[model samples]
Target chain A: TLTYDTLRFAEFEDFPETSEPVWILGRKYSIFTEKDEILSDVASRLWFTYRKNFPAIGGTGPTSDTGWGCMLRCGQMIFAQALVCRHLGRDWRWTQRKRQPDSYFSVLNAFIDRKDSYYSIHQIAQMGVGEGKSIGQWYGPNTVAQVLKKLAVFDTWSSLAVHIAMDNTVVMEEIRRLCRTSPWRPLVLLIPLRLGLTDINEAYVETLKHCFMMPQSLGVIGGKPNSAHYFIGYVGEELIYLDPATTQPAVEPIPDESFHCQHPPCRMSIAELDPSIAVGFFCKTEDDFNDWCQQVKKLALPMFELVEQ
Target chain B: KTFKQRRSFEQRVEDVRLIREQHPTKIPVIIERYKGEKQLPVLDKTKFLVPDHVNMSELIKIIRRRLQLNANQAFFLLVNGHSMVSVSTPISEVYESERDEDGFLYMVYASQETFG
Candidate 1:
């Protein structure tokens, strides 16, 4: 027989339960960081903000994040976690082979063979800032990596006794990979270019290299996306792009407007804006590029050859 | 059994607004699109019924009113059942089960025990 206590506790705890409050609500409320705190604070003053009351006491705890609220909050947590991971300084690699001009197909082919490497969607979610919102949807390099990582992990998580008993994991993985591998990478490239840095060449190059050399090469870029000037250092033995910014002394600071909104950051002219010109550089022969950079620096910044790869 | 009185429409809507504002990033723009517009739908409690309770009709009425749904519109009302089997029946068996009064009641009892 149903009793009032269960209902009361259910409803109360539902609003602030462990699944919702601690993970979903807690994570959602906590994402504001310093940038979003003002808005969060004002929202709290008008109503009991999840951030303030999160991990709440009494009946106002995690249970509050039940139902749709829980699902949405969980998504937000995962999304925010991915973004935070990137912001905490991640190295990304290019997955496409330079020899293959067909960027999309090359990446798809690479996705098949890159078995040992782990790609976490949580990591890509960290790239959510600015135009990154678009990448999340595209099944692009980052999204591809993320989906692969998510599937690998979900394989284990979905195998919980209940799921295994139901035989749900079999169909689940199939459906998931199908959706993940679809032509979403192109779509992911279209998000608005609101990121702080226009020249993330370092990140772009690193992401490409890692994707191309998977299992053999892993790359990570370290820096905040919002800073006026941040460095994208290589994680392993690899080559980088030969942009004036990274190569020759700055002829002049590239205006923010000069930056194109493509992955791997490119420069385009106003006339090029009609089609929204996108440009990217790939390190085909890491050795060749590294040697070329050494020769260029020997003339420009000879002393800088001391700079490590 | 005594309980807190259900919140009025205005009160619940206010709470929803509060929740939306607290996590703007989490709340989709679509959900907030109707914020300042005319009375928006609130929670639809009618779609679910509290199992084994006499107050189901009342709950339905409250849900309908809150969600501002017409009687003809599809709705669900679930009663909180304390039976495990009732909730745990495999999805594949849903269509074939020949449920009767005594059997149903027994299942409910068994479910309630397991649920407890």
Candidate 2:
């Protein structure tokens, strides 16, 4: 009764063959006919899992972000999406044992889990000290979003405008203020939200899906820490996410296969998602952001408010 | 209102009717706090008598005043246990559609979660 694929992969099962459409990032695929492409696309995403033996925060802090580092890892995973989108186009694919672009390696180096790396765990942890989260303390979606906005200030390579819109209000002028650098630095806009009091309000699931369908989508991160997951897109009522629960050894100079999720990605029901979340959108050019503004102006966001001013 | 939940559904509906009969200028709103979120301080009153003309954004202003919240402090309110109603709509308009079977415009407030 067991197939070779099932036996070879006992833990992470192959994606189910269903007529249901699978949405990955902003693109859609058919699991029935395009299973290979679907898997390829998922594997193409930057998977930032928990790492052991990384340089400690403040040079003496915890080396492993195993328990309390899940959300930061999630933040790293989600932002890596933005960087990848900025460097390589969304259609960029990652084949096994293949050479990558110079920009791709740049993306990898920034999140290398070291002290000096731009968005490394050490950087994130130390930056979080301003937000009152001590090293090895837990992070919520808003905390990580805020820290990322602050850290993006010094990242000259990507030259990003990381805007963490607060109080559930995304004001157009406020974003313009942040993005008004020379040539309109590529934008990574994060809006932190709580979709329900306890469990996710069912009313927000469709809105969640609609966010992922947008071309500028960088997907979303966790609600709270039962555990944190980097949600990419939806298939039916289930959301496909990249989990940051795995603990791997630190990568030195060479960026290897450990950064990619070789097995099938994880999925959970839509209702099971935690109520607290931060939705992200990446706009490389100002025109893309204009389109995003137009689309959201017409959309009725029950989860958040969008102010044109 | 766990601060006190002695009244039955019928009694609560009658209370709504009486309040409406006497003071048509205000909407009887139950402002419950979601304890699952510990960051936000507790409200002083459970049954808030909200003015009819103000928008949801205006209601949030009143809530922050009660909480004495800083300008940048994060908070959110949901209507009918399901959705965060648009802040532009007046409380009267929301009450007309989303009032519960007990006839109260129920709302719950909470801050965002921490995710480390």
Candidate 3:
């Protein structure tokens, strides 16, 4: 239970390394016990930052009509942190940036302003005419990957790769296998509205175990008019998430009880996902593209058939 | 070549009505627990009676109540062995396509492993 006051007063030092309950604001909030703690060194780098850090990031400072800026904000945060880790060899903590010109917003705006970068939230919304109107809009996994590639944010050493399961169980299974076998890298997973909660839960668990280098952040897109939200981490049975639409300083933790029921909290149990929406994974890697090709070829070889003349 | 007459709108409506009448509102369904699941309640029998109008969403709740599952414990209901059933799928449709020769609709119930 993160309150606004505790969130404001809480520092990284307050989060203990052990499982003991820490006293915060005259209350005992349970910290992670050794057994429940699963986030890796890199996964733990994901921190809760308000999406309203810049108008371009979320349309305005926290309260403005950002529409569907959750994916953009989540992507911005994850990419910024990942880039920082790759370049600066440090975690991207959310420090109050008063006069810093090279903040995430500046970099993001610079990328968008480039001649090659053409996609916008408004443009994405308009593209889905018959599918549904994108107001605050939903961005598919490919779109995010394309933007990252266009911006060339990963530098020459690393590249952005996008994989979409698209309801294909085989492809999804293979992707999970790849995540397990491949070297650790920071990945941005975009869960569409159609994937069931159970599938998402399974993938999240797999990611924690195998893809430890990836951030714990998940881009969740779906709501009344179709919006976006970021799933930060899991605490016990509760999922801690940051809703871009909300003004709260602290991220919202929706326990399993409320997660299965409503939309306002805009949270859901993994079992309740719709399964028709698409899920995207943004994995940053230095591995050659040929490696993936070889892996896919090997996986598909057994299922291949020779045609008779 | 001569072509047959096209069906009228009224005839199409009647055909749809007849099709609906052919299927009963209530059907029997059998749910099997996955080998990994240990928390779900043990039942004497896996078979249960349900209405054709009951969707997967409604069925999950019924199963939850029967098993007395907690909110944090997540489960997946799949038809046959692999096809994951959506919450909105009507029991009748699943039964119509997936029921075994003995007329039992096969479903697998598995709990989600979140941490490990």
Candidate 4:
């Protein structure tokens, strides 16, 4: 409860004044020179926080995800990032009270906290039942990744081939086959990994940081032991993340500014990150995915393998 | 019992030396469950004198059957606590690079942690 209370009541510390370059997803910013740019880039990326008073998960399920849907929200935030990349380009920014593109509205609607939305809380929670979780239950990276893969099949609008590479290997042939099945359906690959037993090994720290540097990077979803966060990028030895601990009221299709975090994002030492994590990537086309494979193959010691199958 | 708890580190090294002397073709490996892991069951044995020809995929199959896991169940082996070796990587290949100074390959099995 002490940890719980602090998250709700405490104000987040702003980004530190540093000369080190700040990386967000695929772009880099000099914190000392581009302070304003840094905050909006972190903010422009969708921040999925906890919500209450939404439609019940299963008609009568928990109305509030105050206690158990943090990871589900993390999954939403990551998937929403993919959709943003899919419809709008990576440079698209989210501003309030302005007329946005139709695709942006569609992207937001997919996660509108409603029952019929393509990737809503209701859809994610209900699909989780098949993965052996009851309603209002906690979710790990792989659990939510698996469920999202299952849910993506029903979403024709996105036409994405959501792949979760298991066994610590990304078989190139397998992905080739999965993405080739249709329009080279933009690949949204999620790789769930455990970096250490209790603490993250130092050897993997640099490799993990290297992930944020990739152009196709969709960031990572993992957190401290009890809470979950959407890791966007890194600066120095610390990670830049969008936390999903705050609870706000559910919104209608015409949503407000609550969905976006105006304040500078939070940061924590990379060592503080839990070992349980799902690294995400979005390849908008076949060429993009193949280029990502080439980049991965050059890594001397990778977190996962990029094999021929 | 945990391998470290069963005998002293020196004795464990001597045991590995003897095992290598006896079966030069086999790799001495120790497998343990992560302390924080709650869902996966502990393996029946800690000392896995695996054949050198055995690859990670084959070893995972052996472990999966031992645990009676379903096809959809999640399982992975972390080499030296941090890295997940390729499924097709041979035990000998991993043993060469990841073996401890005590002349043994160590690994821990765990599922990802859930959050609320």
Question: By TM-score, who's the top model here?
Answer: 4
Full candidate order by DockQ, most accurate first:
4, 2, 3, 1
Model 4 — TM-score against the truth? 0.89
Per-residue lDDT over A1-309 for candidate 3, one digit per residue giving the tens place of the 0 to 100 score: 755655222233223254533221112335644221222221232332222222232243123224444455444444544444444333333323233225434333322311222233332222323223234444433334334434443243333233332222224444444444536434333332222323333443322212112232233322222434344333333333335454322212211111111121222343433222222334444242234334333330111111111
Question: lDDT (CA) for every model shown?
Answer: 0.22, 0.82, 0.38, 0.85
Candidate 2: segments with Cα more than 4 A from true spot: A1-13, A223-225, A297-301, B6-24, B28-30, B44-49, B65-73, B99-104
- Per-residue lDDT tens digits for candidate 1, residues A28-80, read 22222221321222111101001111222223322222211211122222222
Q: Worst ten-residue run, lDDT, model 2 chain A? A: A5-14
TM-score of each candidate? 0.16, 0.87, 0.39, 0.89
Q: Which of 3 and 4 is the better model by TM-score?
A: 4
In model 4, the runs with Cα more than 4 Å from the true position are A1-13, B6-22, B45-47, B70-73, B84-89, B96-104
User: Between which residue pairs do clashes occur in model 2?
Assistant: A139-B115, A139-B116, A140-B114, A140-B115, A223-A276
Per-prediction TM-score, chain B alone: 0.25, 0.89, 0.68, 0.91
List runs of model 3 lying over 4 Å from the truth: A1-90, A97-106, A110-123, A126-159, A168-227, A246-282, A286-309, B1-116
Better by TM-score, candidate 2 or 1: 2
TM-score of 2: 0.87
lDDT of 4 by residue, B15-51 (tens): 8899999999999998888666777888877788899
Indicate the docking level reached by candidate 1: incorrect
